[PDB]
PDB file of all heavy atoms in Angstrom:
ATOM      1  N   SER A  50      -6.662   7.967   2.811  1.00  0.00           N
ATOM      2  CA  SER A  50      -6.883   9.353   2.354  1.00  0.00           C
ATOM      3  C   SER A  50      -5.773  10.114   3.180  1.00  0.00           C
ATOM      4  O   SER A  50      -4.789   9.462   3.416  1.00  0.00           O
ATOM      5  CB  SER A  50      -8.262   9.912   2.649  1.00  0.00           C
ATOM      6  OG  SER A  50      -9.183   9.126   1.965  1.00  0.00           O
ATOM      7  N   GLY A  51      -5.938  11.327   3.531  1.00  0.00           N
ATOM      8  CA  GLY A  51      -5.085  11.946   4.555  1.00  0.00           C
ATOM      9  C   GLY A  51      -5.130  11.315   5.884  1.00  0.00           C
ATOM     10  O   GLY A  51      -5.645  10.216   6.173  1.00  0.00           O
ATOM     11  N   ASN A  52      -4.500  12.003   6.846  1.00  0.00           N
ATOM     12  CA  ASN A  52      -3.735  11.516   8.018  1.00  0.00           C
ATOM     13  C   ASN A  52      -4.248  10.220   8.625  1.00  0.00           C
ATOM     14  O   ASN A  52      -3.445   9.353   8.906  1.00  0.00           O
ATOM     15  CB  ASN A  52      -3.686  12.549   9.090  1.00  0.00           C
ATOM     16  CG  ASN A  52      -2.864  13.688   8.774  1.00  0.00           C
ATOM     17  OD1 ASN A  52      -1.845  13.550   7.988  1.00  0.00           O
ATOM     18  ND2 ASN A  52      -3.163  14.922   9.308  1.00  0.00           N
ATOM     19  N   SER A  53      -5.526  10.074   8.918  1.00  0.00           N
ATOM     20  CA  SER A  53      -6.135   8.790   9.378  1.00  0.00           C
ATOM     21  C   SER A  53      -7.443   8.468   8.704  1.00  0.00           C
ATOM     22  O   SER A  53      -8.322   7.740   9.364  1.00  0.00           O
ATOM     23  CB  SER A  53      -6.175   8.802  10.897  1.00  0.00           C
ATOM     24  OG  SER A  53      -6.780   7.530  11.271  1.00  0.00           O
ATOM     25  N   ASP A  54      -7.752   8.922   7.494  1.00  0.00           N
ATOM     26  CA  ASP A  54      -9.093   8.769   7.003  1.00  0.00           C
ATOM     27  C   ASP A  54      -9.251   7.447   6.251  1.00  0.00           C
ATOM     28  O   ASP A  54      -9.451   7.468   4.996  1.00  0.00           O
ATOM     29  CB  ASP A  54      -9.391   9.935   6.064  1.00  0.00           C
ATOM     30  CG  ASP A  54      -9.533  11.242   6.811  1.00  0.00           C
ATOM     31  OD1 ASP A  54      -8.965  11.281   7.913  1.00  0.00           O
ATOM     32  OD2 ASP A  54     -10.075  12.152   6.237  1.00  0.00           O
ATOM     33  N   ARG A  55      -9.124   6.355   6.949  1.00  0.00           N
ATOM     34  CA  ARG A  55      -9.354   5.080   6.428  1.00  0.00           C
ATOM     35  C   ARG A  55     -10.831   4.819   5.848  1.00  0.00           C
ATOM     36  O   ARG A  55     -11.686   5.438   6.375  1.00  0.00           O
ATOM     37  CB  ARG A  55      -8.875   3.990   7.381  1.00  0.00           C
ATOM     38  CG  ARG A  55      -7.529   4.191   7.931  1.00  0.00           C
ATOM     39  CD  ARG A  55      -7.033   2.999   8.688  1.00  0.00           C
ATOM     40  NE  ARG A  55      -6.069   3.325   9.801  1.00  0.00           N
ATOM     41  CZ  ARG A  55      -6.271   3.974  10.849  1.00  0.00           C
ATOM     42  NH1 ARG A  55      -7.605   4.467  11.185  1.00  0.00           N
ATOM     43  NH2 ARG A  55      -5.345   4.272  11.728  1.00  0.00           N
ATOM     44  N   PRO A  56     -10.977   3.866   4.861  1.00  0.00           N
ATOM     45  CA  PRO A  56     -12.366   3.521   4.612  1.00  0.00           C
ATOM     46  C   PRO A  56     -12.922   2.533   5.464  1.00  0.00           C
ATOM     47  O   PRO A  56     -12.217   1.993   6.407  1.00  0.00           O
ATOM     48  CB  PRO A  56     -12.227   2.986   3.120  1.00  0.00           C
ATOM     49  CG  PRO A  56     -10.774   2.723   2.922  1.00  0.00           C
ATOM     50  CD  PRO A  56     -10.004   3.227   4.043  1.00  0.00           C
ATOM     51  N   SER A  57     -14.224   2.216   5.299  1.00  0.00           N
ATOM     52  CA  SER A  57     -14.883   1.394   6.124  1.00  0.00           C
ATOM     53  C   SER A  57     -14.674  -0.090   5.758  1.00  0.00           C
ATOM     54  O   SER A  57     -15.135  -0.633   4.699  1.00  0.00           O
ATOM     55  CB  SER A  57     -16.435   1.538   6.052  1.00  0.00           C
ATOM     56  OG  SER A  57     -16.906   1.387   4.758  1.00  0.00           O
ATOM     57  N   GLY A  58     -13.793  -0.798   6.529  1.00  0.00           N
ATOM     58  CA  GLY A  58     -13.493  -2.217   6.325  1.00  0.00           C
ATOM     59  C   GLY A  58     -12.100  -2.485   5.972  1.00  0.00           C
ATOM     60  O   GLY A  58     -11.736  -3.428   5.247  1.00  0.00           O
ATOM     61  N   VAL A  59     -11.176  -1.755   6.568  1.00  0.00           N
ATOM     62  CA  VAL A  59      -9.722  -2.037   6.444  1.00  0.00           C
ATOM     63  C   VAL A  59      -9.123  -2.122   7.766  1.00  0.00           C
ATOM     64  O   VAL A  59      -9.553  -1.495   8.792  1.00  0.00           O
ATOM     65  CB  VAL A  59      -9.067  -1.010   5.535  1.00  0.00           C
ATOM     66  CG1 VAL A  59      -8.940   0.341   6.223  1.00  0.00           C
ATOM     67  CG2 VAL A  59      -7.731  -1.469   4.978  1.00  0.00           C
ATOM     68  N   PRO A  60      -8.046  -3.005   8.081  1.00  0.00           N
ATOM     69  CA  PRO A  60      -7.356  -2.944   9.306  1.00  0.00           C
ATOM     70  C   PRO A  60      -6.618  -1.594   9.453  1.00  0.00           C
ATOM     71  O   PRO A  60      -6.124  -0.978   8.459  1.00  0.00           O
ATOM     72  CB  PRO A  60      -6.341  -4.097   9.109  1.00  0.00           C
ATOM     73  CG  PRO A  60      -6.844  -4.924   7.986  1.00  0.00           C
ATOM     74  CD  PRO A  60      -8.035  -4.315   7.372  1.00  0.00           C
ATOM     75  N   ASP A  61      -6.420  -1.192  10.688  1.00  0.00           N
ATOM     76  CA  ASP A  61      -5.937   0.132  11.033  1.00  0.00           C
ATOM     77  C   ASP A  61      -4.453   0.283  11.055  1.00  0.00           C
ATOM     78  O   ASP A  61      -3.994   1.166  11.686  1.00  0.00           O
ATOM     79  CB  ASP A  61      -6.610   0.637  12.336  1.00  0.00           C
ATOM     80  CG  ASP A  61      -6.284  -0.209  13.597  1.00  0.00           C
ATOM     81  OD1 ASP A  61      -5.366  -1.120  13.579  1.00  0.00           O
ATOM     82  OD2 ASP A  61      -7.019  -0.056  14.598  1.00  0.00           O
ATOM     83  N   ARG A  62      -3.724  -0.700  10.470  1.00  0.00           N
ATOM     84  CA  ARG A  62      -2.288  -0.573  10.404  1.00  0.00           C
ATOM     85  C   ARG A  62      -1.849   0.550   9.452  1.00  0.00           C
ATOM     86  O   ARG A  62      -0.907   1.243   9.789  1.00  0.00           O
ATOM     87  CB  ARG A  62      -1.683  -1.915   9.941  1.00  0.00           C
ATOM     88  CG  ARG A  62      -1.698  -3.042  10.951  1.00  0.00           C
ATOM     89  CD  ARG A  62      -0.922  -4.179  10.473  1.00  0.00           C
ATOM     90  NE  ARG A  62      -1.378  -4.643   9.108  1.00  0.00           N
ATOM     91  CZ  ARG A  62      -2.537  -5.264   8.902  1.00  0.00           C
ATOM     92  NH1 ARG A  62      -3.434  -5.513   9.750  1.00  0.00           N
ATOM     93  NH2 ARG A  62      -2.806  -5.543   7.567  1.00  0.00           N
ATOM     94  N   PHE A  63      -2.609   0.832   8.366  1.00  0.00           N
ATOM     95  CA  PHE A  63      -2.274   1.792   7.416  1.00  0.00           C
ATOM     96  C   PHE A  63      -2.686   3.205   7.968  1.00  0.00           C
ATOM     97  O   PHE A  63      -3.842   3.621   7.832  1.00  0.00           O
ATOM     98  CB  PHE A  63      -3.100   1.503   6.115  1.00  0.00           C
ATOM     99  CG  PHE A  63      -3.082   0.079   5.691  1.00  0.00           C
ATOM    100  CD1 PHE A  63      -4.246  -0.642   5.647  1.00  0.00           C
ATOM    101  CD2 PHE A  63      -1.888  -0.538   5.467  1.00  0.00           C
ATOM    102  CE1 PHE A  63      -4.261  -1.979   5.251  1.00  0.00           C
ATOM    103  CE2 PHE A  63      -1.893  -1.833   5.074  1.00  0.00           C
ATOM    104  CZ  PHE A  63      -3.096  -2.556   4.927  1.00  0.00           C
ATOM    105  N   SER A  64      -1.731   3.895   8.619  1.00  0.00           N
ATOM    106  CA  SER A  64      -1.868   5.234   8.927  1.00  0.00           C
ATOM    107  C   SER A  64      -1.187   6.107   7.868  1.00  0.00           C
ATOM    108  O   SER A  64      -0.617   5.612   6.961  1.00  0.00           O
ATOM    109  CB  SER A  64      -1.394   5.538  10.314  1.00  0.00           C
ATOM    110  OG  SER A  64      -2.298   5.165  11.284  1.00  0.00           O
ATOM    111  N   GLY A  65      -1.411   7.460   8.003  1.00  0.00           N
ATOM    112  CA  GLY A  65      -0.809   8.384   6.977  1.00  0.00           C
ATOM    113  C   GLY A  65      -0.422   9.689   7.680  1.00  0.00           C
ATOM    114  O   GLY A  65      -0.639   9.909   8.834  1.00  0.00           O
ATOM    115  N   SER A  66       0.258  10.450   6.848  1.00  0.00           N
ATOM    116  CA  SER A  66       0.810  11.776   7.346  1.00  0.00           C
ATOM    117  C   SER A  66       1.003  12.579   6.085  1.00  0.00           C
ATOM    118  O   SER A  66       0.931  12.117   4.935  1.00  0.00           O
ATOM    119  CB  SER A  66       2.067  11.557   8.113  1.00  0.00           C
ATOM    120  OG  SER A  66       3.032  10.894   7.418  1.00  0.00           O
ATOM    121  N   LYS A  67       1.352  13.882   6.377  1.00  0.00           N
ATOM    122  CA  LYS A  67       1.697  14.805   5.308  1.00  0.00           C
ATOM    123  C   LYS A  67       2.840  15.723   5.845  1.00  0.00           C
ATOM    124  O   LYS A  67       2.816  16.054   7.039  1.00  0.00           O
ATOM    125  CB  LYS A  67       0.508  15.731   4.875  1.00  0.00           C
ATOM    126  CG  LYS A  67      -0.457  15.036   4.003  1.00  0.00           C
ATOM    127  CD  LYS A  67      -1.586  15.996   3.587  1.00  0.00           C
ATOM    128  CE  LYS A  67      -2.756  15.155   2.820  1.00  0.00           C
ATOM    129  NZ  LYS A  67      -3.999  15.333   3.583  1.00  0.00           N
ATOM    130  N   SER A  68       3.857  16.016   4.925  1.00  0.00           N
ATOM    131  CA  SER A  68       4.962  16.809   5.437  1.00  0.00           C
ATOM    132  C   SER A  68       5.523  17.502   4.212  1.00  0.00           C
ATOM    133  O   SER A  68       6.133  16.929   3.305  1.00  0.00           O
ATOM    134  CB  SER A  68       6.027  15.916   5.990  1.00  0.00           C
ATOM    135  OG  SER A  68       5.641  15.366   7.241  1.00  0.00           O
ATOM    136  N   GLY A  69       5.310  18.878   4.155  1.00  0.00           N
ATOM    137  CA  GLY A  69       5.802  19.706   3.126  1.00  0.00           C
ATOM    138  C   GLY A  69       5.128  19.431   1.797  1.00  0.00           C
ATOM    139  O   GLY A  69       3.961  19.780   1.635  1.00  0.00           O
ATOM    140  N   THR A  70       5.959  18.875   0.843  1.00  0.00           N
ATOM    141  CA  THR A  70       5.358  18.462  -0.361  1.00  0.00           C
ATOM    142  C   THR A  70       5.458  16.933  -0.567  1.00  0.00           C
ATOM    143  O   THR A  70       5.793  16.343  -1.564  1.00  0.00           O
ATOM    144  CB  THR A  70       6.095  19.086  -1.601  1.00  0.00           C
ATOM    145  OG1 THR A  70       7.435  18.700  -1.557  1.00  0.00           O
ATOM    146  CG2 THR A  70       5.909  20.645  -1.486  1.00  0.00           C
ATOM    147  N   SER A  71       5.157  16.213   0.591  1.00  0.00           N
ATOM    148  CA  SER A  71       5.366  14.814   0.651  1.00  0.00           C
ATOM    149  C   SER A  71       4.292  14.161   1.462  1.00  0.00           C
ATOM    150  O   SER A  71       3.487  14.827   2.122  1.00  0.00           O
ATOM    151  CB  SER A  71       6.831  14.380   1.189  1.00  0.00           C
ATOM    152  OG  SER A  71       6.778  14.394   2.564  1.00  0.00           O
ATOM    153  N   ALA A  72       4.262  12.812   1.513  1.00  0.00           N
ATOM    154  CA  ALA A  72       3.256  12.065   2.328  1.00  0.00           C
ATOM    155  C   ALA A  72       3.863  10.721   2.731  1.00  0.00           C
ATOM    156  O   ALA A  72       5.076  10.531   2.482  1.00  0.00           O
ATOM    157  CB  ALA A  72       1.980  11.887   1.591  1.00  0.00           C
ATOM    158  N   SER A  73       3.048   9.872   3.276  1.00  0.00           N
ATOM    159  CA  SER A  73       3.587   8.638   3.850  1.00  0.00           C
ATOM    160  C   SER A  73       2.517   7.555   3.891  1.00  0.00           C
ATOM    161  O   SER A  73       1.262   7.938   4.004  1.00  0.00           O
ATOM    162  CB  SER A  73       4.215   8.826   5.203  1.00  0.00           C
ATOM    163  OG  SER A  73       3.293   8.635   6.227  1.00  0.00           O
ATOM    164  N   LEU A  74       2.884   6.312   3.949  1.00  0.00           N
ATOM    165  CA  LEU A  74       2.020   5.098   4.217  1.00  0.00           C
ATOM    166  C   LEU A  74       2.702   4.191   5.178  1.00  0.00           C
ATOM    167  O   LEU A  74       3.150   3.182   4.896  1.00  0.00           O
ATOM    168  CB  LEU A  74       1.715   4.435   2.892  1.00  0.00           C
ATOM    169  CG  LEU A  74       0.681   3.333   2.894  1.00  0.00           C
ATOM    170  CD1 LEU A  74      -0.774   3.803   3.229  1.00  0.00           C
ATOM    171  CD2 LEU A  74       0.671   2.483   1.712  1.00  0.00           C
ATOM    172  N   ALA A  75       3.041   4.779   6.400  1.00  0.00           N
ATOM    173  CA  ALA A  75       3.640   3.977   7.436  1.00  0.00           C
ATOM    174  C   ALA A  75       2.699   2.796   7.780  1.00  0.00           C
ATOM    175  O   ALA A  75       1.556   3.059   8.240  1.00  0.00           O
ATOM    176  CB  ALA A  75       3.833   4.884   8.692  1.00  0.00           C
ATOM    177  N   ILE A  76       3.138   1.526   7.508  1.00  0.00           N
ATOM    178  CA  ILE A  76       2.362   0.411   7.859  1.00  0.00           C
ATOM    179  C   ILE A  76       3.210  -0.332   8.972  1.00  0.00           C
ATOM    180  O   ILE A  76       4.234  -0.867   8.614  1.00  0.00           O
ATOM    181  CB  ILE A  76       2.119  -0.484   6.645  1.00  0.00           C
ATOM    182  CG1 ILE A  76       1.534   0.261   5.489  1.00  0.00           C
ATOM    183  CG2 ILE A  76       1.229  -1.641   6.997  1.00  0.00           C
ATOM    184  CD1 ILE A  76       1.457  -0.493   4.169  1.00  0.00           C
ATOM    185  N   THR A  77       2.685  -0.473  10.113  1.00  0.00           N
ATOM    186  CA  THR A  77       3.382  -0.975  11.323  1.00  0.00           C
ATOM    187  C   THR A  77       2.895  -2.425  11.462  1.00  0.00           C
ATOM    188  O   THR A  77       1.753  -2.732  11.736  1.00  0.00           O
ATOM    189  CB  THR A  77       3.126  -0.120  12.500  1.00  0.00           C
ATOM    190  OG1 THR A  77       3.486   1.236  12.328  1.00  0.00           O
ATOM    191  CG2 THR A  77       3.841  -0.739  13.736  1.00  0.00           C
ATOM    192  N   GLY A  78       3.922  -3.328  11.467  1.00  0.00           N
ATOM    193  CA  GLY A  78       3.647  -4.687  11.781  1.00  0.00           C
ATOM    194  C   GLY A  78       2.923  -5.488  10.774  1.00  0.00           C
ATOM    195  O   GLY A  78       1.791  -5.865  10.908  1.00  0.00           O
ATOM    196  N   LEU A  79       3.562  -5.679   9.548  1.00  0.00           N
ATOM    197  CA  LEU A  79       3.033  -6.210   8.385  1.00  0.00           C
ATOM    198  C   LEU A  79       2.672  -7.660   8.587  1.00  0.00           C
ATOM    199  O   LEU A  79       3.113  -8.400   9.452  1.00  0.00           O
ATOM    200  CB  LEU A  79       3.978  -6.141   7.158  1.00  0.00           C
ATOM    201  CG  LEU A  79       4.224  -4.860   6.465  1.00  0.00           C
ATOM    202  CD1 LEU A  79       4.995  -3.825   7.199  1.00  0.00           C
ATOM    203  CD2 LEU A  79       4.843  -5.286   5.130  1.00  0.00           C
TER     204      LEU A  79
END
């Protein structure tokens, strides 16, 4: 979801952000 609103049962590599009219799915260390 937005910035760090992960669901129950996923690894926490998938963080998020919002910037202007854009977003991101920075996944660190695949």
